[PDB]
Amino acid sequence: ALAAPPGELTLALTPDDKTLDPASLDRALAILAEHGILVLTGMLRTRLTDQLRTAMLDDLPEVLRQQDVPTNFVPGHVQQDPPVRESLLFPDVLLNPVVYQITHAVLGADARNAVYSGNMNLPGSHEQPVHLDEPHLWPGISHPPYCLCVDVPLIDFTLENGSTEYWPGSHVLNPDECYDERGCVLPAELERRRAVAPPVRFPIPVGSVVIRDGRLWHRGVPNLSAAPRPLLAMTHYTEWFDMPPIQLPDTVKSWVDGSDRHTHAHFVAGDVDHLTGDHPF
Amino acid sequence: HMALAAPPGELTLALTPDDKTLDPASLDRALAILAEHGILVLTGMLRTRLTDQLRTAMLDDLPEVLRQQDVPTNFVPGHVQQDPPVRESLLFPDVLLNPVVYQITHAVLGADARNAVYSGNMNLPGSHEQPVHLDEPHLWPGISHPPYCLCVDVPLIDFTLENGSTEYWPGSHVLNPDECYDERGCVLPAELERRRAVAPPVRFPIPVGSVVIRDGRLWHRGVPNLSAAPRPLLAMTHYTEWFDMPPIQLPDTVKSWVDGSDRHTHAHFVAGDVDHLHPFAV
Ligand SMILES: NC[C@H]1O[C@H](O[C@H]2[C@H](O)[C@@H](O[C@H]3O[C@H](CO)[C@@H](O)[C@H](N)[C@H]3O)[C@H](N)C[C@@H]2N)[C@H](N)[C@@H](O)[C@@H]1O
Ligand SMILES: NC[C@H]1O[C@H](O[C@H]2[C@H](O)[C@@H](O[C@H]3O[C@H](CO)[C@@H](O)[C@H](N)[C@H]3O)[C@H](N)C[C@@H]2N)[C@H](N)[C@@H](O)[C@@H]1O
Ligand code: NI
Ligand code: NI
């Protein structure tokens, strides 16, 4: 439990920073390689995070009204996709030049975003088990990254309101009998790892982007504030990793499909139902 | 290269078409051969009734393939990419869903491994020499990692040293030094000569009815067919569930037995016929 993002994991940026100088990029990649998690503070304008926060809080009633509310492991951790309306699809969020500079260097120039989702942590939420979002590709084998989660807090994350617990360096661990069918870490391996490299939790100011190995051990924790804690979630994969495409309206096709910052996208005529995924074509 | 009179014993498991399963010792030997050498020859797997129909169908299609404006060719003249027909009458469970093949690919790639290729290589008389290449790259440069794909090659005639039996580089499937491969999967000549000194390539006859299973990363090349008859090969490739591939187009008249199976196929089922006569030509 820290007062701020630890300097060992953190690069302090401004929203005007378009690309890292070679020394900054080398430090960014050294942090991801060693720790599996990188915090970039001050990247997104409050204008963008304000609109995304508002849109997801406005959508929450429609999510909670569903017959079965999609939940991550335990009560209060709701899966919620942000809107894919043209007015809420921002190049600086989907196609951030600093994020893609980092993901291109780790995953290659053909790396592609294939997730546009979110994690709404409700007041009174329960403790998640420690897990990874994406598995190792073979059991018992050491291999490099094939995916980088890109997490965008939409309010100030604090120790009180459910700032994620991260397990530094856990992204390289893949012993036999380590993971169950839900990507939860088997308790024996949790405790062995805790003795060598215990987890961390820290406040993350809104405007930050967290880039982490998709294999990093982490868990959502109780939100003990009065307000829901929204996170917007993206994940960059190597070109060769099979993912369903992100459904986007064809009104963003002009700037999404042009880019050398690739998205695995399917462009739809008219509006996408971002909550039910249940539009006709 | 080393020119042999038969498939070498070190790379070969002799079966009959009645063999539905390898006993544990045979399976262990099969996996040890794939791990060490990256290529396994299984003789006597397919009935002549099946290979006769597939051979006939591909030779009958060849005129229509060669009549096209732009003939899909692998690297050099005479190595033609040709899909076998996906008519229901020529789609055989013992070819698409072979129990011995999937026993081996399940053990190497997992129970979720899937066939995502149903294609072919027609080697024409007077064909040229291909450069040495791999069909599927390593997933990261400079890194050692296990297999993610197994090519399943079905000769549709007897392959001989004369009619273009493939050159294979045994043990080459684990080699991934920096700056080894170009954008077409060709091996840098400097790495070819370093490797040749330690483990030279081999060419050998393979009788029709055989199935060749090899690491998709194995170094190989098509060679000149010096006979007067085209040399047809039917080609399939099993991949880990997580490797992105376009689906095989199949008619919905095989959906009942293909889509049921615990021998997975990455398939898109179409109403009516597929026009099989190219995305896999390099
Ligand atoms: N950080 C972004 C998001 O990450 C997780 O979603 C992930 C899944 O974890 C992953 O699934 C993997 O894990 C499961 C168990 O290992 C397997 O069934 C599955 N076959 C395997 O590919 C999908 N491929 C992609 C999806 N975006 C969280 N739930 C989600 O709330 C969060 O926003
Ligand atoms: N043994 C079966 C077949 O294998 C090869 O075809 C392969 C391609 O090689 C492969 O492509 C890979 O290698 C390319 C060339 O470098 C890269 O561009 C590409 N990114 C990379 O995925 C495709 N994915 C699948 C296709 N079946 C031969 N060509 C073909 O004649 C033969 O019948
Ligand atoms: Ni998670
Ligand atoms: Ni080839």
Side-chain angles (χ1 to χ4, degrees):
Chain A
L2 278 53
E8 290 85 359
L9 304 183
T10 302
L11 213 70
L13 299 180
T14 75
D16 291 327
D17 287 301
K18 239 239 204 234
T19 71
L20 302 177
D21 61 288
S24 293
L25 183 62
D26 288 346
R27 183 161 178 274
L29 300 179
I31 291 165
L32 270 183
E34 186 184 347
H35 299 300
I37 171 163
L38 172 65
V39 187
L40 308 171
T41 65
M43 280 205 50
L44 301 181
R45 276 173 166 118
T46 146
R47 159 77 178 151
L48 300 184
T49 51
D50 280 343
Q51 281 170 277
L52 293 169
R53 187 198 68 243
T54 294
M56 288 192 72
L57 292 174
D58 290 344
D59 277 345
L60 182 53
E62 201 188 328
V63 174
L64 292 176
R65 205 184 307 129
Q66 295 189 223
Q67 292 189 205
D68 230 283
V69 181
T71 226
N72 295 301
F73 296 107
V74 300
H77 300 269
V78 173
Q79 194 73 15
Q80 181 177 332
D81 296 348
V84 292
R85 297 195 286 283
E86 127 84 36
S87 58
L88 294 167
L89 291 166
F90 305 119
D92 279 343
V93 176
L94 270 78
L95 308 180
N96 188 281
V98 170
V99 171
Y100 274 90
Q101 189 186 14
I102 292 158
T103 69
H104 282 165
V106 174
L107 300 181
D110 293 315
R112 52 195 196 159
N113 188 33
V115 170
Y116 199 65
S117 200
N119 310 31
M120 185 71 80
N121 185 347
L122 301 183
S125 60
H126 294 192
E127 299 86 0
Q128 284 184 338
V130 179
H131 62 279
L132 38 63
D133 286 349
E134 290 285 6
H136 299 263
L137 293 176
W138 310 260
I141 291 293
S142 191
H143 64 77
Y146 70 95
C147 58
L148 292 172
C149 293
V150 181
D151 289 344
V152 182
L154 296 181
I155 62 164
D156 289 335
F157 279 21
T158 71
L159 293 181
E160 175 185 70
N161 75 5
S163 202
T164 307
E165 180 178 280
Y166 301 116
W167 290 62
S170 63
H171 62 297
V172 299
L173 303 177
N174 188 31
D176 300 308
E177 320 280 42
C178 191
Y179 306 106
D180 71 12
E181 64 281 346
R182 303 169 300 151
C184 294
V185 181
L186 283 160
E189 290 297 345
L190 259 199
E191 179 68 12
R192 274 163 76 191
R193 179 59 180 179
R194 195 187 304 270
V196 166
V200 297
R201 298 185 61 215
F202 47 86
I204 306 171
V206 67
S208 302
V209 176
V210 178
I211 305 175
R212 58 181 179 86
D213 200 304
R215 304 166 300 168
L216 193 75
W217 303 357
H218 69 291
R219 57 158 163 134
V221 303
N223 176 3
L224 302 179
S225 75
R229 181 232 66 170
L231 181 82
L232 182 151
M234 297 174 289
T235 311
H236 292 197
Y237 298 82
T238 60
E239 48 104 355
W240 47 254
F241 192 78
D242 188 24
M243 287 293 289
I246 304 162
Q247 318 267 257
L248 293 180
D250 57 9
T251 52
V252 297
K253 186 173 187 183
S254 48
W255 61 266
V256 173
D257 202 32
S259 186
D260 67 7
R261 301 168 205 156
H262 298 170
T263 310
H264 186 40
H266 175 68
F267 301 97
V268 157
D271 304 301
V272 188
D273 168 20
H274 53 281
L275 309 174
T276 334
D278 255 23
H279 49 282
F281 298 98
Chain B
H1 66 99
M2 301 297 135
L4 282 48
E10 308 97 83
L11 304 185
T12 304
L13 186 42
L15 299 177
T16 74
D18 294 329
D19 290 302
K20 229 90 168 223
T21 284
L22 301 180
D23 61 287
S26 292
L27 183 60
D28 289 342
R29 186 157 167 277
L31 301 180
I33 290 165
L34 276 173
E36 187 183 345
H37 299 298
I39 172 162
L40 172 64
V41 183
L42 306 173
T43 63
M45 283 209 51
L46 301 174
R47 287 159 163 111
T48 77
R49 166 74 144 124
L50 298 186
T51 53
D52 281 346
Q53 281 170 276
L54 292 172
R55 186 198 67 243
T56 294
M58 289 194 73
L59 293 175
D60 290 345
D61 279 344
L62 181 55
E64 196 189 326
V65 174
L66 292 176
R67 202 217 253 113
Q68 297 307 280
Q69 297 203 208
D70 232 284
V71 181
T73 224
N74 294 296
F75 296 105
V76 297
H79 296 273
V80 172
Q81 196 73 29
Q82 182 179 331
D83 291 355
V86 291
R87 296 197 285 283
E88 126 84 37
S89 60
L90 294 166
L91 291 168
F92 303 121
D94 279 345
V95 175
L96 272 71
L97 305 183
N98 188 282
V100 168
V101 170
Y102 273 91
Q103 191 186 10
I104 292 161
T105 70
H106 281 166
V108 175
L109 299 180
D112 291 313
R114 52 193 196 161
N115 188 31
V117 175
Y118 195 66
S119 199
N121 295 93
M122 188 71 78
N123 186 345
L124 300 182
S127 62
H128 294 196
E129 220 202 3
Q130 283 183 338
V132 178
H133 62 279
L134 37 63
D135 286 347
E136 289 285 11
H138 299 263
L139 293 176
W140 310 260
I143 293 293
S144 294
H145 66 76
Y148 70 94
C149 55
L150 292 171
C151 293
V152 182
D153 289 345
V154 181
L156 296 182
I157 62 165
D158 291 334
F159 280 21
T160 72
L161 296 181
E162 178 187 56
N163 75 5
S165 203
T166 307
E167 179 181 280
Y168 299 118
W169 289 63
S172 62
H173 61 297
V174 298
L175 303 176
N176 187 30
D178 302 305
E179 320 280 44
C180 188
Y181 306 107
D182 69 13
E183 322 206 40
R184 299 187 312 160
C186 294
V187 181
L188 194 73
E191 292 297 343
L192 273 186
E193 296 308 296
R194 274 188 204 100
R195 182 56 182 180
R196 194 187 303 273
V198 164
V202 300
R203 296 175 202 190
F204 49 84
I206 309 169
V208 68
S210 302
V211 176
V212 180
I213 302 174
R214 58 183 178 84
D215 201 303
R217 306 167 297 170
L218 195 75
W219 304 356
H220 70 291
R221 59 154 138 230
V223 304
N225 175 3
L226 312 163
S227 77
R231 182 231 67 171
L233 180 80
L234 183 150
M236 296 172 293
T237 310
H238 292 199
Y239 296 84
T240 60
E241 138 126 335
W242 47 253
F243 194 77
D244 188 24
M245 285 296 289
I248 302 162
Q249 303 275 107
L250 292 180
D252 57 10
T253 53
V254 299
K255 187 173 180 164
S256 49
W257 61 266
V258 173
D259 200 33
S261 187
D262 66 5
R263 301 169 202 158
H264 298 165
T265 307
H266 187 40
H268 175 66
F269 301 96
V270 155
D273 294 302
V274 179
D275 172 21
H276 57 284
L277 313 178
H278 203 292
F280 297 161
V282 187

PDB file of all heavy atoms in Angstrom, chain B residues 70-95:
ATOM      1  N   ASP B  70      -3.330 -15.920 -64.304  1.00  0.00           N
ATOM      2  CA  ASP B  70      -2.165 -15.894 -63.373  1.00  0.00           C
ATOM      3  C   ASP B  70      -2.193 -17.151 -62.497  1.00  0.00           C
ATOM      4  O   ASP B  70      -3.067 -17.263 -61.637  1.00  0.00           O
ATOM      5  CB  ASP B  70      -2.070 -14.605 -62.546  1.00  0.00           C
ATOM      6  CG  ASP B  70      -0.686 -13.985 -62.659  1.00  0.00           C
ATOM      7  OD1 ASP B  70       0.247 -14.526 -62.017  1.00  0.00           O
ATOM      8  OD2 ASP B  70      -0.538 -12.988 -63.423  1.00  0.00           O
ATOM      9  N   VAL B  71      -1.272 -18.079 -62.758  1.00  0.00           N
ATOM     10  CA  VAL B  71      -1.215 -19.409 -62.097  1.00  0.00           C
ATOM     11  C   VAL B  71      -0.458 -19.222 -60.789  1.00  0.00           C
ATOM     12  O   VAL B  71       0.701 -18.840 -60.794  1.00  0.00           O
ATOM     13  CB  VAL B  71      -0.579 -20.473 -63.014  1.00  0.00           C
ATOM     14  CG1 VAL B  71      -0.543 -21.828 -62.338  1.00  0.00           C
ATOM     15  CG2 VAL B  71      -1.319 -20.587 -64.346  1.00  0.00           C
ATOM     16  N   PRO B  72      -1.091 -19.464 -59.625  1.00  0.00           N
ATOM     17  CA  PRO B  72      -0.417 -19.310 -58.337  1.00  0.00           C
ATOM     18  C   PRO B  72       0.717 -20.341 -58.232  1.00  0.00           C
ATOM     19  O   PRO B  72       0.486 -21.529 -58.372  1.00  0.00           O
ATOM     20  CB  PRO B  72      -1.512 -19.563 -57.285  1.00  0.00           C
ATOM     21  CG  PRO B  72      -2.549 -20.404 -58.025  1.00  0.00           C
ATOM     22  CD  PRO B  72      -2.467 -19.955 -59.476  1.00  0.00           C
ATOM     23  N   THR B  73       1.918 -19.839 -57.996  1.00  0.00           N
ATOM     24  CA  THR B  73       3.182 -20.587 -58.079  1.00  0.00           C
ATOM     25  C   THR B  73       3.958 -20.329 -56.790  1.00  0.00           C
ATOM     26  O   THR B  73       3.948 -19.186 -56.321  1.00  0.00           O
ATOM     27  CB  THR B  73       3.887 -20.186 -59.384  1.00  0.00           C
ATOM     28  OG1 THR B  73       4.362 -21.382 -59.976  1.00  0.00           O
ATOM     29  CG2 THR B  73       5.026 -19.214 -59.190  1.00  0.00           C
ATOM     30  N   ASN B  74       4.610 -21.355 -56.242  1.00  0.00           N
ATOM     31  CA  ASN B  74       5.430 -21.256 -55.010  1.00  0.00           C
ATOM     32  C   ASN B  74       6.900 -21.026 -55.420  1.00  0.00           C
ATOM     33  O   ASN B  74       7.599 -22.003 -55.765  1.00  0.00           O
ATOM     34  CB  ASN B  74       5.182 -22.460 -54.108  1.00  0.00           C
ATOM     35  CG  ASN B  74       3.758 -22.502 -53.565  1.00  0.00           C
ATOM     36  OD1 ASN B  74       3.383 -21.620 -52.827  1.00  0.00           O
ATOM     37  ND2 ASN B  74       2.935 -23.489 -53.918  1.00  0.00           N
ATOM     38  N   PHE B  75       7.318 -19.754 -55.417  1.00  0.00           N
ATOM     39  CA  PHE B  75       8.710 -19.251 -55.552  1.00  0.00           C
ATOM     40  C   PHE B  75       9.215 -19.305 -56.997  1.00  0.00           C
ATOM     41  O   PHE B  75       9.803 -18.320 -57.460  1.00  0.00           O
ATOM     42  CB  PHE B  75       9.685 -20.034 -54.660  1.00  0.00           C
ATOM     43  CG  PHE B  75       9.430 -19.894 -53.181  1.00  0.00           C
ATOM     44  CD1 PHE B  75       8.849 -20.923 -52.452  1.00  0.00           C
ATOM     45  CD2 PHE B  75       9.778 -18.734 -52.520  1.00  0.00           C
ATOM     46  CE1 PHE B  75       8.608 -20.793 -51.097  1.00  0.00           C
ATOM     47  CE2 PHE B  75       9.555 -18.620 -51.163  1.00  0.00           C
ATOM     48  CZ  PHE B  75       8.964 -19.639 -50.457  1.00  0.00           C
ATOM     49  N   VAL B  76       9.093 -20.451 -57.667  1.00  0.00           N
ATOM     50  CA  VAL B  76       9.734 -20.692 -58.985  1.00  0.00           C
ATOM     51  C   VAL B  76       8.772 -21.480 -59.862  1.00  0.00           C
ATOM     52  O   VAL B  76       7.824 -22.097 -59.354  1.00  0.00           O
ATOM     53  CB  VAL B  76      11.081 -21.421 -58.839  1.00  0.00           C
ATOM     54  CG1 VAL B  76      12.105 -20.597 -58.052  1.00  0.00           C
ATOM     55  CG2 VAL B  76      10.895 -22.818 -58.259  1.00  0.00           C
ATOM     56  N   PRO B  77       8.971 -21.447 -61.207  1.00  0.00           N
ATOM     57  CA  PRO B  77       8.094 -22.175 -62.127  1.00  0.00           C
ATOM     58  C   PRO B  77       7.904 -23.671 -61.799  1.00  0.00           C
ATOM     59  O   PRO B  77       8.863 -24.326 -61.422  1.00  0.00           O
ATOM     60  CB  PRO B  77       8.768 -21.963 -63.485  1.00  0.00           C
ATOM     61  CG  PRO B  77       9.453 -20.609 -63.337  1.00  0.00           C
ATOM     62  CD  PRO B  77       9.935 -20.584 -61.900  1.00  0.00           C
ATOM     63  N   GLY B  78       6.670 -24.154 -61.961  1.00  0.00           N
ATOM     64  CA  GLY B  78       6.309 -25.584 -61.908  1.00  0.00           C
ATOM     65  C   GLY B  78       5.728 -26.023 -60.576  1.00  0.00           C
ATOM     66  O   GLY B  78       5.249 -27.165 -60.511  1.00  0.00           O
ATOM     67  N   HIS B  79       5.802 -25.195 -59.529  1.00  0.00           N
ATOM     68  CA  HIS B  79       5.279 -25.538 -58.178  1.00  0.00           C
ATOM     69  C   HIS B  79       3.936 -24.840 -57.964  1.00  0.00           C
ATOM     70  O   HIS B  79       3.918 -23.711 -57.475  1.00  0.00           O
ATOM     71  CB  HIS B  79       6.331 -25.212 -57.106  1.00  0.00           C
ATOM     72  CG  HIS B  79       7.560 -26.041 -57.252  1.00  0.00           C
ATOM     73  ND1 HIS B  79       7.690 -27.282 -56.670  1.00  0.00           N
ATOM     74  CD2 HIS B  79       8.689 -25.831 -57.961  1.00  0.00           C
ATOM     75  CE1 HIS B  79       8.872 -27.790 -56.988  1.00  0.00           C
ATOM     76  NE2 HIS B  79       9.505 -26.919 -57.782  1.00  0.00           N
ATOM     77  N   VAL B  80       2.853 -25.464 -58.389  1.00  0.00           N
ATOM     78  CA  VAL B  80       1.527 -24.803 -58.531  1.00  0.00           C
ATOM     79  C   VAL B  80       0.732 -25.048 -57.244  1.00  0.00           C
ATOM     80  O   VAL B  80       0.738 -26.197 -56.756  1.00  0.00           O
ATOM     81  CB  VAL B  80       0.803 -25.347 -59.778  1.00  0.00           C
ATOM     82  CG1 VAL B  80      -0.635 -24.868 -59.867  1.00  0.00           C
ATOM     83  CG2 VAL B  80       1.575 -24.984 -61.039  1.00  0.00           C
ATOM     84  N   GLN B  81       0.118 -24.004 -56.695  1.00  0.00           N
ATOM     85  CA  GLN B  81      -0.825 -24.140 -55.558  1.00  0.00           C
ATOM     86  C   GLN B  81      -2.171 -24.570 -56.156  1.00  0.00           C
ATOM     87  O   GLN B  81      -2.666 -23.879 -57.063  1.00  0.00           O
ATOM     88  CB  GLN B  81      -0.930 -22.835 -54.752  1.00  0.00           C
ATOM     89  CG  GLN B  81      -1.574 -23.021 -53.379  1.00  0.00           C
ATOM     90  CD  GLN B  81      -0.703 -23.717 -52.355  1.00  0.00           C
ATOM     91  OE1 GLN B  81       0.541 -23.622 -52.419  1.00  0.00           O
ATOM     92  NE2 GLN B  81      -1.347 -24.392 -51.395  1.00  0.00           N
ATOM     93  N   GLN B  82      -2.694 -25.702 -55.719  1.00  0.00           N
ATOM     94  CA  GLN B  82      -3.953 -26.280 -56.237  1.00  0.00           C
ATOM     95  C   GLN B  82      -4.696 -26.918 -55.067  1.00  0.00           C
ATOM     96  O   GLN B  82      -4.179 -27.882 -54.471  1.00  0.00           O
ATOM     97  CB  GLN B  82      -3.697 -27.299 -57.350  1.00  0.00           C
ATOM     98  CG  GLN B  82      -4.973 -27.871 -57.945  1.00  0.00           C
ATOM     99  CD  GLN B  82      -4.726 -28.859 -59.060  1.00  0.00           C
ATOM    100  OE1 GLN B  82      -3.713 -28.763 -59.761  1.00  0.00           O
ATOM    101  NE2 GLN B  82      -5.629 -29.824 -59.238  1.00  0.00           N
ATOM    102  N   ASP B  83      -5.863 -26.379 -54.746  1.00  0.00           N
ATOM    103  CA  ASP B  83      -6.787 -26.960 -53.749  1.00  0.00           C
ATOM    104  C   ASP B  83      -7.426 -28.198 -54.357  1.00  0.00           C
ATOM    105  O   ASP B  83      -7.895 -28.161 -55.496  1.00  0.00           O
ATOM    106  CB  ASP B  83      -7.869 -25.955 -53.350  1.00  0.00           C
ATOM    107  CG  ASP B  83      -7.348 -24.784 -52.545  1.00  0.00           C
ATOM    108  OD1 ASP B  83      -6.151 -24.781 -52.192  1.00  0.00           O
ATOM    109  OD2 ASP B  83      -8.162 -23.888 -52.301  1.00  0.00           O
ATOM    110  N   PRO B  84      -7.502 -29.313 -53.599  1.00  0.00           N
ATOM    111  CA  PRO B  84      -8.335 -30.428 -53.999  1.00  0.00           C
ATOM    112  C   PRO B  84      -9.799 -30.014 -53.911  1.00  0.00           C
ATOM    113  O   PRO B  84     -10.144 -29.054 -53.220  1.00  0.00           O
ATOM    114  CB  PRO B  84      -8.012 -31.557 -53.017  1.00  0.00           C
ATOM    115  CG  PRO B  84      -7.363 -30.866 -51.841  1.00  0.00           C
ATOM    116  CD  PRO B  84      -6.823 -29.535 -52.318  1.00  0.00           C
ATOM    117  N   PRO B  85     -10.709 -30.717 -54.623  1.00  0.00           N
ATOM    118  CA  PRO B  85     -12.131 -30.400 -54.555  1.00  0.00           C
ATOM    119  C   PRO B  85     -12.674 -30.585 -53.128  1.00  0.00           C
ATOM    120  O   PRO B  85     -12.194 -31.466 -52.393  1.00  0.00           O
ATOM    121  CB  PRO B  85     -12.766 -31.436 -55.497  1.00  0.00           C
ATOM    122  CG  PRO B  85     -11.634 -31.835 -56.413  1.00  0.00           C
ATOM    123  CD  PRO B  85     -10.417 -31.852 -55.513  1.00  0.00           C
ATOM    124  N   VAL B  86     -13.636 -29.743 -52.766  1.00  0.00           N
ATOM    125  CA  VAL B  86     -14.403 -29.837 -51.494  1.00  0.00           C
ATOM    126  C   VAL B  86     -15.855 -30.181 -51.850  1.00  0.00           C
ATOM    127  O   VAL B  86     -16.762 -29.666 -51.205  1.00  0.00           O
ATOM    128  CB  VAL B  86     -14.251 -28.552 -50.647  1.00  0.00           C
ATOM    129  CG1 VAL B  86     -12.842 -28.418 -50.112  1.00  0.00           C
ATOM    130  CG2 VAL B  86     -14.618 -27.296 -51.419  1.00  0.00           C
ATOM    131  N   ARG B  87     -16.055 -31.023 -52.868  1.00  0.00           N
ATOM    132  CA  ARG B  87     -17.320 -31.761 -53.116  1.00  0.00           C
ATOM    133  C   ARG B  87     -17.457 -32.850 -52.050  1.00  0.00           C
ATOM    134  O   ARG B  87     -16.418 -33.469 -51.699  1.00  0.00           O
ATOM    135  CB  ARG B  87     -17.307 -32.413 -54.501  1.00  0.00           C
ATOM    136  CG  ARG B  87     -17.241 -31.430 -55.655  1.00  0.00           C
ATOM    137  CD  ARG B  87     -17.637 -32.089 -56.967  1.00  0.00           C
ATOM    138  NE  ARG B  87     -16.617 -32.969 -57.520  1.00  0.00           N
ATOM    139  CZ  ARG B  87     -15.504 -32.567 -58.155  1.00  0.00           C
ATOM    140  NH1 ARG B  87     -15.220 -31.276 -58.305  1.00  0.00           N
ATOM    141  NH2 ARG B  87     -14.657 -33.467 -58.618  1.00  0.00           N
ATOM    142  N   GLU B  88     -18.683 -33.099 -51.591  1.00  0.00           N
ATOM    143  CA  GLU B  88     -18.980 -34.075 -50.509  1.00  0.00           C
ATOM    144  C   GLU B  88     -18.401 -35.447 -50.895  1.00  0.00           C
ATOM    145  O   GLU B  88     -17.839 -36.100 -50.001  1.00  0.00           O
ATOM    146  CB  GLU B  88     -20.483 -34.052 -50.183  1.00  0.00           C
ATOM    147  CG  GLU B  88     -21.201 -35.392 -50.228  1.00  0.00           C
ATOM    148  CD  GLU B  88     -21.107 -36.244 -48.972  1.00  0.00           C
ATOM    149  OE1 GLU B  88     -21.131 -35.673 -47.847  1.00  0.00           O
ATOM    150  OE2 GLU B  88     -21.028 -37.487 -49.109  1.00  0.00           O
ATOM    151  N   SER B  89     -18.468 -35.835 -52.178  1.00  0.00           N
ATOM    152  CA  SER B  89     -18.054 -37.181 -52.667  1.00  0.00           C
ATOM    153  C   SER B  89     -16.535 -37.388 -52.552  1.00  0.00           C
ATOM    154  O   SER B  89     -16.104 -38.552 -52.619  1.00  0.00           O
ATOM    155  CB  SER B  89     -18.544 -37.443 -54.067  1.00  0.00           C
ATOM    156  OG  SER B  89     -18.039 -36.485 -54.979  1.00  0.00           O
ATOM    157  N   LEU B  90     -15.750 -36.317 -52.376  1.00  0.00           N
ATOM    158  CA  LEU B  90     -14.264 -36.393 -52.306  1.00  0.00           C
ATOM    159  C   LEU B  90     -13.743 -35.883 -50.952  1.00  0.00           C
ATOM    160  O   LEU B  90     -12.510 -35.729 -50.808  1.00  0.00           O
ATOM    161  CB  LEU B  90     -13.675 -35.625 -53.491  1.00  0.00           C
ATOM    162  CG  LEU B  90     -13.966 -36.221 -54.867  1.00  0.00           C
ATOM    163  CD1 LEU B  90     -13.637 -35.213 -55.976  1.00  0.00           C
ATOM    164  CD2 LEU B  90     -13.202 -37.515 -55.084  1.00  0.00           C
ATOM    165  N   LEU B  91     -14.634 -35.709 -49.964  1.00  0.00           N
ATOM    166  CA  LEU B  91     -14.266 -35.315 -48.581  1.00  0.00           C
ATOM    167  C   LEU B  91     -14.418 -36.533 -47.688  1.00  0.00           C
ATOM    168  O   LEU B  91     -15.551 -36.913 -47.372  1.00  0.00           O
ATOM    169  CB  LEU B  91     -15.117 -34.129 -48.117  1.00  0.00           C
ATOM    170  CG  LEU B  91     -14.808 -32.821 -48.849  1.00  0.00           C
ATOM    171  CD1 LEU B  91     -15.856 -31.784 -48.570  1.00  0.00           C
ATOM    172  CD2 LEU B  91     -13.430 -32.287 -48.486  1.00  0.00           C
ATOM    173  N   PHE B  92     -13.279 -37.126 -47.313  1.00  0.00           N
ATOM    174  CA  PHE B  92     -13.200 -38.437 -46.632  1.00  0.00           C
ATOM    175  C   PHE B  92     -12.787 -38.232 -45.187  1.00  0.00           C
ATOM    176  O   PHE B  92     -11.770 -37.597 -44.929  1.00  0.00           O
ATOM    177  CB  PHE B  92     -12.204 -39.321 -47.372  1.00  0.00           C
ATOM    178  CG  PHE B  92     -12.520 -39.523 -48.827  1.00  0.00           C
ATOM    179  CD1 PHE B  92     -11.621 -39.146 -49.809  1.00  0.00           C
ATOM    180  CD2 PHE B  92     -13.698 -40.152 -49.214  1.00  0.00           C
ATOM    181  CE1 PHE B  92     -11.908 -39.359 -51.152  1.00  0.00           C
ATOM    182  CE2 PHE B  92     -13.981 -40.373 -50.555  1.00  0.00           C
ATOM    183  CZ  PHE B  92     -13.092 -39.970 -51.520  1.00  0.00           C
ATOM    184  N   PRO B  93     -13.570 -38.738 -44.209  1.00  0.00           N
ATOM    185  CA  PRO B  93     -13.178 -38.677 -42.801  1.00  0.00           C
ATOM    186  C   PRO B  93     -11.748 -39.184 -42.552  1.00  0.00           C
ATOM    187  O   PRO B  93     -11.073 -38.612 -41.726  1.00  0.00           O
ATOM    188  CB  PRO B  93     -14.207 -39.580 -42.094  1.00  0.00           C
ATOM    189  CG  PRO B  93     -15.438 -39.549 -43.012  1.00  0.00           C
ATOM    190  CD  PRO B  93     -14.898 -39.348 -44.413  1.00  0.00           C
ATOM    191  N   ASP B  94     -11.311 -40.237 -43.251  1.00  0.00           N
ATOM    192  CA  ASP B  94      -9.974 -40.845 -43.032  1.00  0.00           C
ATOM    193  C   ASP B  94      -8.864 -39.897 -43.539  1.00  0.00           C
ATOM    194  O   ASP B  94      -7.694 -40.124 -43.158  1.00  0.00           O
ATOM    195  CB  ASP B  94      -9.878 -42.237 -43.653  1.00  0.00           C
ATOM    196  CG  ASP B  94     -10.491 -43.348 -42.814  1.00  0.00           C
ATOM    197  OD1 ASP B  94     -10.758 -43.124 -41.612  1.00  0.00           O
ATOM    198  OD2 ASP B  94     -10.659 -44.454 -43.350  1.00  0.00           O
ATOM    199  N   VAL B  95      -9.202 -38.882 -44.344  1.00  0.00           N
ATOM    200  CA  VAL B  95      -8.245 -37.832 -44.796  1.00  0.00           C
ATOM    201  C   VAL B  95      -8.372 -36.585 -43.905  1.00  0.00           C
ATOM    202  O   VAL B  95      -7.339 -36.172 -43.336  1.00  0.00           O
ATOM    203  CB  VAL B  95      -8.441 -37.506 -46.284  1.00  0.00           C
ATOM    204  CG1 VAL B  95      -7.556 -36.357 -46.720  1.00  0.00           C
ATOM    205  CG2 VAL B  95      -8.205 -38.724 -47.164  1.00  0.00           C
TER     206      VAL B  95
END
